[PDB]
Design a protein around this ligand. Structure first.
Ligand SMILES: Oc1ccnc2cc(C(F)(F)F)ccc12
Ligand SMILES: Oc1ccnc2cc(C(F)(F)F)ccc12
Ligand SMILES: Oc1ccnc2cc(C(F)(F)F)ccc12
Lengths: 290, 290, 290, 290, 290, 290
């Protein structure tokens, strides 16, 4: 980097308005996609969480791991049942999901982050009853139907969670939690991140995705938008690809719940978190209420 | 229980001297064997940890899970290498060990305990860098030899651990931890419990075992002992069966490290923890220094 | 006690639901009758208060001492005046009552409890203005009439009292307190216990009595009841013996004031507190609202 | 008081150097003699303790009551045994001493002080094990001899005592305390005050006495001294009247123990505490080390 | 001072009711006039602030310095513009006012007070944004007119100010503060003291003045009053000399804002603060609501 | 700034190692020269202090103002006396120095910083006795000689200073302080910064200067050095220009006193603080011990 020093200066100085806005605040980050599978992006993500924490910002990580679960099920020769396009989560599939999410995928992020200090701590809803789940149905070609032990976040121990954060820790959340009877369900990571963000009074929700941002008329490149209100985007929802739906519903639930902004950012960009939070050069889509 | 009320009274009153001795103290409990596999014993163990916690005693659980790892390795068709009688812990075997211990075995104890309240919290050494490991060799028919990513506890974040306890939580520890280079090792649960007990200034170390207690001349039933000093027991060590060695070495390292007493108790007895801690009717073997 | 160990276990395990319910809670105990005069019961009562305290339960003791006052007055040759069946409390009788309750009866309980640790602390309403009294009249064969410096609890320094408890102390209260002009009155111990329980948000009020429990049609043994609501018991009040009235009015005032349950238990049973709180084998009468 | 306002000003301004020296400090005051029996002096003493407390000074009161005990013993017709000039303290005499000191004499000071606010709190060594006693012998015409349950202060719960003070309370101490076996002894109030002052790191010990101050050659009025070192006064001790000995030994033990100054002041002067602490016009005798 | 000791006592004892009333309370003191220019009065004022602080009272000093500013402007040869009888505060005059008030007049009081301890701390509204100003107009022979950078107190950081006080500091305030755009204005010290007193929930506002007290029909000496309600005094306002107006408007705004009493006291009396606060012999005028 | 986003990212990511090193640490910054006179540099300096503070770093500003004092003295027509090349600091010159430093120069930095939040607070050694001074002599062509009220920092209230910082404030220090007799001296800002840094356990001392960095053989441009140990630089001292001496002696005293590094950086560079702290592209000279 033979770039002149007087320009390295202005780039750092231009972070100041967002350092002020985020100082002392909770930022919830959904981590998934290629930012989770490529080692250079992986290590940049962990470094950015250490960054936030060494600015006195309070990052909270919620992670997915859909593909890793199905690979483990294939390795174990566990045959799936499928209603619509959904695998049914039997007690057996849940045990596998839990052990992959919490005992594999969560662990690598904890150790990556912890390469910068004693920051990361892995948690599920079962730990200290931090949050509960309610069983969810899906609608397949009409009819709402049961697909097993799959839920939404029900209640969140907001107080206990913020203590963890105020102590300097970076929670890395694996989305599993007990229902009211103690039966552990798997929760979609995108919706769980929205619920955590709302419960914790987060200042921002970040959703790492494998796309540049929200297109309204995909694939027209002219259709990429950089900011949008919830009213307009809720109207656009039925239009989007199957992959963008959960990310967009998360931002709707979050920002309607009072989180000031939710962002869909490009997880294939190194240090996308830094770019989105501390420069005005972000590719992402910012969702505000209206 | 049609037992006269005036005798239910004296049994409760006779717990008082041990309630006083244990109030506000750390008690580390190694959990394994049949107390971990049978549901009635399982649920009694979880209830006893909730008991300790609702007396203002500070229990810390360290758990094993040797047999569950090997079953999972067999299910995954992962072929083992064996030096002496020891499986070699490749990077692959560690990933499996970690995901079974932390994402399976630890989870069921957390949910069992948590049936009584928001007490249990699952942790490894990687979480908040709570403890580190140093790689260990074994000696096979002489020569010390490498069996992969297997270690002993190196350093323990004593302060951070006691904060967790003082907040009312029951840590459930899965024995994995990074070395000084961030490479995660698996640690024998018995030795890890001894190290945790010493680091935390525990008042007692409890070691749940599938035997009545320490026999000196097994199988003479006359040989069962109820208390012994470290000097005498260290001399007896080379005599014992292969299974009793790790449990006895744990008690030696703990009590020599200053834990006032380590106990080998019968994990096949329902509520053995309550029996050992709050009555004088215990079957176990108490180890003190001398 | 050659009783099998596996039954000592279940008796201790069956205390757990009440340990959970009482952990961190205030329990007010009225102490009087034979539980106060017999040394074995005395020492069992003190041990049970140390028990509660070493479970992290917050016991508060309120004590009487009617017979001891009159013996001291006889020793001092102080002639009483009597309206109805009530001694008139002159300034002289109050001085004697105060010095017997606080400087004699309170002291022996403090030293008994303190045999188990630095727990007990003796207090009156005059200490730190912990509570005040309002002068009470009685009705004798009709007419309400003055019987001197005898009162009811007026206001309670709830905050200052809970600080004392949260510091690990067991207050032993002698029921004397100043009126609004600084004139110290003697308060009936049963009613004072009800008022303290309500003011402190106690979880239970215990009333030690020299009877098995509440009989509705004394002396029919078939008439003994184990639970009753305030509506039913208030209707029964005018029926009861002169001795049971103050104990029952205390439970009415307490449970109507929001204390979840008040209990009349048999003070002639060793460790009656333990029996009533930690087993379902109690002889007492539980009063709930309705 | 038609005294010019500009002189009322200078009298208040001249208190400032002693307000600074005493701010935040413990001052132990032995209260006895006529300052305890005359109502105008009584009420002035209580007002001065409220004064100290409303300056953020930490007064601690230790009280005697020798004559009141013997009057109560005479009223109760309890015949004394006497070795030398000392009554023997039987178990019976102790019970009476305790109930008079703690339940009579201590109570009136608590209520007097408390006329100014919720300040005073009565305590003995038995309360929260605040201090213990060791049995003391006396020497009668030579031989050291037993005179029953009479002791010296042994150990003081310094930490627990300062918490009481830091919370804004004024402890009023009745000098009774258990020995190591739980047997309560009566302690001479003068020596107890010296021990409390030393244990608490008091800035001053005040000893209220029925004399102008220390005379060296009583009754020469020329012999009255205003300051003296411990070396000189220890040499003078064997010379003094029987009454002055305990007050002087208290000041020796205190100032040698590190209390910066002990004072013998005239308890027959209204507001003697204010005079001694906040003016240079005191009649008392100040004892410093040397 | 050969004044009898028994009268020095009563003068100190008679301070007690006001020590109780003021213990732990904020007292705001406007300091100006001759109490600020004469060294003996200066040093008495500083000593009295140290007095309050060593009683656990919380004094807050607000100071003026009108004449010192104009002398400095004359020394600097800065020619004034005058509308009505008011100098126009140009940017230049403000710089001079700020540097005289904060860097000269405030400094001497800080060092005087600090001769008694580390108490005084100098502050303006610009420090930690402790308070802001809104630009004020005056009315000259009718028309409201601009006289430059002169304002009233707008908002006060009440919380941050009380932290400063609770830490044992004596704030010495120089009345300058930024408007909402960061432009620093000079504020009349009398009105600023009233605003600070109201914002901080002061118990008393003291206004040091170069007069005996409020006269209603000056110069009739019969017309001097010692207490008055706000309703009566507001009606009297239009009657008073030009000098008394700001002092009286301050007391009106303060006491109407809920400060229990504001006092106009004679700053030419040594230790006037002590006289006014701790005796009933004050010359001042007390203003209460009504 | 049309600079590619992926490079704005790496510049921010490369700050992380210094964010970690400085998180929670004190950094003392000497502010003077052109960074204080040019508005763009001025505002960049204030922004960088707000930056540090919004990273949870603890900046402390010490400022000079030599030229502003002499301009004010000329405006006031105050004739100087000069020994060697030093103005004599009479009582009159000190009053002027204090009022310029604290009431002019300190104020503009406080308001600049405070444009970003309630951070800055102006202090001198007289405030809360934060630090004292000892009178210093200089040596003029040999003889050490008195030049009036000019001193070095003597003692620093380390505890009180760190409280101020831990509360989120940015102290802006004007270098004046009382000697042991309360006589306020002016202290050279460079040496004062070194003393403050050592007393506070600062992690870095920054010295803003009007040069690129330390030249060893000025004006050889080949002679500019980027790092140097104290042993080597102490040997070089007698070689340097008159202007560089105080900056270099400050770094010697600081780093020898245990501050890990002192830096001489170019105050004519915008955001030099950011450049020096968060990039490896700094022009400055770093001084470490050796
Ligand atoms: O409150 C908590 C819930 C779950 N895990 C936790 C882990 C830690 C620790 F820092 F110990 F890893 C502390 C606190 C936790
Ligand atoms: O707050 C209190 C009121 C009455 N007595 C008290 C006794 C103690 C002590 F523990 F010192 F005995 C503490 C606190 C008290
Ligand atoms: O909160 C504050 C505002 C302005 N000045 C302050 C000065 C001090 C100190 F005590 F350091 F002088 C502390 C705290 C302050």
């Amino acid at each position: 980097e033979a770039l002149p020093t007087h320009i390295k200066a202005q780039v750092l100085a231009e972070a100041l308005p967002w350092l002020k806005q985020l100082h002392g605040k909770v930022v919830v980050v959904k981590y998934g996609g290629n930012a989770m599978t490529d080692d250079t992006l992986r290590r940049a993500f962990a470094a950015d969480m250490a960054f936030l924490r060494n600015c006195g910002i309070h990052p909270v990580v919620v992670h997915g791991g859909g593909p890793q679960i199905t690979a483990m099920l294939r390795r174990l020769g566990i045959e799936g049942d499928f209603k619509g396009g959904f695998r049914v989560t039997t007690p057996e599939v849940l045990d596998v999901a839990r052990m992959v999410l919490f005992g594999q995928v969560g662990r690598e992020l904890v150790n990556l982050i912890n390469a910068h200090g004693p920051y990361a701590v892995g948690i599920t809803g079962e730990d200290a009853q931090l949050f509960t789940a309610v069983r969810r149905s899906v609608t397949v070609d009409g009819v709402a139907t049961d697909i097993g032990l799959v839920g939404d976040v029900d209640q969140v121990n907001t107080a206990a969670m913020l203590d963890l954060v105020a102590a300097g820790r970076i929670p890395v959340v694996s989305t599993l939690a007990p229902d009211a009877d103690g039966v552990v369900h798997n929760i979609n990571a995108d919706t769980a991140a929205a619920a955590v963000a709302e419960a914790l009074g987060a200042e921002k929700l970040l959703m790492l995705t494998d796309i540049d941002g929200l297109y309204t008329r995909w694939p027209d490149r002219d259709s990429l938008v950089s900011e949008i209100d919830t009213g307009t985007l809720a109207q656009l929802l039925p239009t989007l690809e199957s992959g963008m739906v959960p990310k967009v519903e998360a931002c709707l639930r979050a920002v309607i719940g009072g989180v000031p902004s939710a962002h869909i950012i490009d997880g294939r960009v190194t240090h996308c978190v830094l770019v989105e939070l501390f420069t005005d050069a972000g590719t992402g889509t910012k969702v505000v209420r209206g």
